[PDB]
């Protein structure tokens, strides 16, 4: 989407392996606030 009309996908009832991310090193940038990407892969939330 355009940023003014940013798109929001709601996530529910699934198992995310957040380790699929982080990869693809050449231009990804990761910046987590409140937690890292290793510790939350063993965590759960109601809605993402």
């Amino acid at each position: 989407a355009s940023v003014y009309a940013w798109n929001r996908k709601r996530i529910s009832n699934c198992v995310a392996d957040y380790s699929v991310l982080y990869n693809f090193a050449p231009f990804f940038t990761f910046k987590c606030y409140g937690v890292s990407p290793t510790k939350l892969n063993d965590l759960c939330f109601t809605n993402v």
């Binding site: 409140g34 937690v35 890292s36 290793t38 510790k39 939350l40 063993d42």
Partner: protein
């Protein structure tokens, strides 16, 4: 804290909680000593 955060930052967050709850224990024990002196003075009057 650990579940959603790396050690370098988790040591700081746990140290804050430790300081807070350690202050709780100091408040508790100080009041028990001050209040035990009052019941001791009463026990001395009752013995007399």
């Amino acid at each position: 804290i650990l579940s959603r955060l790396d050690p370098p930052e988790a040591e700081v967050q746990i140290d804050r909680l430790i300081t807070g709850r350690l202050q709780s224990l100091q408040t508790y024990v100080t009041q028990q000593l001050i209040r035990a002196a009052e019941i001791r003075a009463s026990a001395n009057l009752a013995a007399t």
